[PDB]
Design a binder for this molecule. Sequence first.
Ligand SMILES: Nc1ncnc2c1ncn2[C@@H]1O[C@H](COP(=O)(O)OP(=O)(O)O)[C@@H](O)[C@H]1O
Ligand SMILES: *[C@@H]1O[C@H](CO)[C@@H](O)[C@H](O)[C@H]1NC(C)=O
Ligand code: ALF
Ligand SMILES: [Mg+2]
Length: 959
Amino acid sequence: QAFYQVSLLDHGRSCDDVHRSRHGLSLQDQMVRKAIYGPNVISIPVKSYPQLLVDEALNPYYGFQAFSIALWLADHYYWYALCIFLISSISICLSLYKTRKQSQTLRDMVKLSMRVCVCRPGGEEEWVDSSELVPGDCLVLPQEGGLMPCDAALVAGECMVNESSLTGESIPVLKTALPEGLGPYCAETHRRHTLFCGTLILQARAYVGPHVLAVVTRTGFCTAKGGLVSSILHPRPINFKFYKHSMKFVAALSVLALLGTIYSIFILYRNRVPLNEIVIRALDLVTVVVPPALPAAMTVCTLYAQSRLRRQGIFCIHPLRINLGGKLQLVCFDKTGTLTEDGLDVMGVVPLKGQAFLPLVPEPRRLPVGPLLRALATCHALSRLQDTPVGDPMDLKMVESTGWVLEEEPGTQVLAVMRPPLWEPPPVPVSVLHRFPFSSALQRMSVVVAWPGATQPEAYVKGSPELVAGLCNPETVPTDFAQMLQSYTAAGYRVVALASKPLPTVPSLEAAQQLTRDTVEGDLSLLGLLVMRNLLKPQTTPVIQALRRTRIRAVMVTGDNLQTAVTVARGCGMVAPQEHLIIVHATHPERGQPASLEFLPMESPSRHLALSGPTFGIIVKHFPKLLPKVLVQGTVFARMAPEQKTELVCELQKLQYCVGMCGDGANDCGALKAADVGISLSQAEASVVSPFTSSMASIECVPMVIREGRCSLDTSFSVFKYMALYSLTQFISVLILYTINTNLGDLQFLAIDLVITTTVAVLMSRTGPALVLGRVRPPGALLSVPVLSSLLLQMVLVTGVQLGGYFLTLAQPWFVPLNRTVAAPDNLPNYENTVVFSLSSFQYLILAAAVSKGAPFRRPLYTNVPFLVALALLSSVLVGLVLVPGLLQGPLALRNITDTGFKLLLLGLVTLNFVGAFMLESVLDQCLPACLRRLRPKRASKKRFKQLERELAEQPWPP
Ligand SMILES: Nc1ncnc2c1ncn2[C@@H]1O[C@H](COP(=O)(O)OP(=O)(O)O)[C@@H](O)[C@H]1O
Ligand SMILES: *[C@@H]1O[C@H](CO)[C@@H](O)[C@H](O)[C@H]1NC(C)=O
Ligand code: ALF
Ligand SMILES: [Mg+2]
């Protein structure tokens, strides 16, 4: 009767229900469920070519150009129509290629199919089906190096999986068996028992089970790998798109087009040409005003920039966003693997005798056998790859520091057995009973471990110092724990605290392993603090100094302790030594206490604010009026959960800041997607994780993403402004002829539009970006006073030389007057056509050189090379033709002029116009300040960030 969403069908499923779904029906249920859900295939439509063309041809311009071709054919200027078709043909081919390439990349990612082993309710079938996989299907996963087709909760056993594409996470991720329960929660809601579509399985092992077996949850390409590709198809728009502002500027040109048309009507009525004939002249005037090569030129800008970035390594999707790059005002960054260096030496461990802390051991090897050694060795979730161990750089560096070595493949629920170094001045090899994974939000990991001693099993928890110390029973927790940790965090050593609890369970029993994560991480005794050292990436310190110099503010958003983040921030130059940092702190509103905000300064040898994640939580919920003041003044947001990073992005965006994100981790995945320009620095090739994936592991990417964006925005504005200048230059030329004896050209028009303008337009879009990122932001409105001024003033100079030419031509003593008695197509030679075309031809080229204006955002024009050769070549051909048309006289329909003097006068006028155009654009750059000061002495931006800044300047936060 009424359709129900697949999510709505399977939203309330119990923990038990996922186990109920396991060993699902072989065929009848499969078929009906598969029919209801639909086939498990990516929904990218496949088009041979002509299938695309019909859809592609529906664009409104294409209709107008088709009408124009017919109109020009009716006028019998076949040649101009021959060009007008050909330029549209180039436009459609390039648009087709652009569209085809954009789909092809996405389609190539999702073009994967492989034979799958599927479990029957009383069966275990092998390689039976893949694309037809049942929505609730249970399958046995491959042993090693196996891509997972569907998002499936793991019912039994443990899996090691590479999720690099899905989460931006290169490091191997542990997967564990789901626990059946009366409560219903989704596998995604667990966010760990689920195995995600399109993720490689490094290894798969069942300690107790015969093999690893998983039950499919959300599937059919509409979730995970496809859910994100599906996002890339029909993508989210950008608000207040600059094309609207250009469309307003087109209306200013529309007034000129109407004014021209009425001028023509009066001239034609005065001329007394047939009314039927005058309509064709009016129609030609309107069609000429439309530029044929603009629609192609807009595509070629983007395609060249994608080309420029692909070579730099910054692999891009949604190429429209490259311009958005140009406008970004703040760039958010992450601490570890981006601002700092991935991989960290263990700078020893600190042990505690009783309540008191003992002095730090430089090398973890030289320590007594007991809890801390075992915890340091066993806490990690490292697995053994072919002749090697694979894990998180921190956990890997820790175990190598201990000197204990992981045992290989060769009880029941016993895994990752840890072999001792077997050097003595007890070896007691130790085996893990239960593994708990590490979640960024959760901020800790835990293990249950047993030994041949066969005592009560001991649970070891390695986590963030504050949370672990808080979780520990306050018996062992030292009085000065905070102050002692403050030494290590202030130094800039990433610190993880280890806590041990003796657990009263039966050792080496599978059943005994089953336990509540909270119950294992409940009552705890603080054991020691690890002192990991992460060092700043060499290039980070430079890029941040440039981004601060441009006045694009850099905010730091991190899950690590506030003092370490402050040390990294003070190091990079987020906060310079001259600048002052305030630590906003908040007390929770609860019992008899209301919410309290306390601001305490920090002093080290622009009023920068550093806020812990929890303080920001209280500020957003219980101080909404203050949030604008802190988010426009906050530089080092720290101890932030993955969800909190998205909130900073969203609140900074609602304040009208254009955000950017350059994180390299699973924690940032949310923030990267939400942010305007999102960059994932550790990924290889194109990925769905971020809009602007990089393959360089540095912040050196971020300047390049801005620098190219500003170039693309200036190229878009230059190509638009040159296309307007050409059309008005054509309008003036065709009109000067329309008044004067009702004449035009055919082969001449093909030559100008097809060779002079289309070649220059495509070739002017490959100049490339400026060397250094600049203070001045690229101009963002096409309908601006400088742009409008520049175009209008230049067209006056175009007309001046053009009219001057005609006056000089008529004034020439040898000059023979025209006919003004026969139709424009019939009068194949006209003495005026020769002069007007010959003067105008060169000026069409000159406009591009003046328009280029390559300095703040783009490199000098000469550096282009293919443009510069074409400009010179076409100029040389035109110089050659104007001096001696020879053979080309006949095709050009040129009236041969023997006199050298008038040709030199004509060359002089073009040179004068050229000098004029260059002088006018240089004058325009110099004149802007005087104009701006007089037009507006002072102004206030509607955007909230610029006002809140100005308010804070007038009255600061309480000092
Ligand atoms: N493998 C781990 N097991 C337990 N705790 C960890 C582990 N790695 C990091 N931590 C701690 O938990 C915090 C949360 O990490 P995360 O949010 O991913 O940020 P980051 O890794 O940048 O510090 C870390 O800052 C650190 O204190
Ligand atoms: C110009 O063209 C006309 C055709 O109308 C023809 O008589 C002769 O070639 C020239 N003379 C005049 C009448 O303008
Ligand atoms: F490594 Al982070 F936020 F600093 F993920
Ligand atoms: Mg990270």
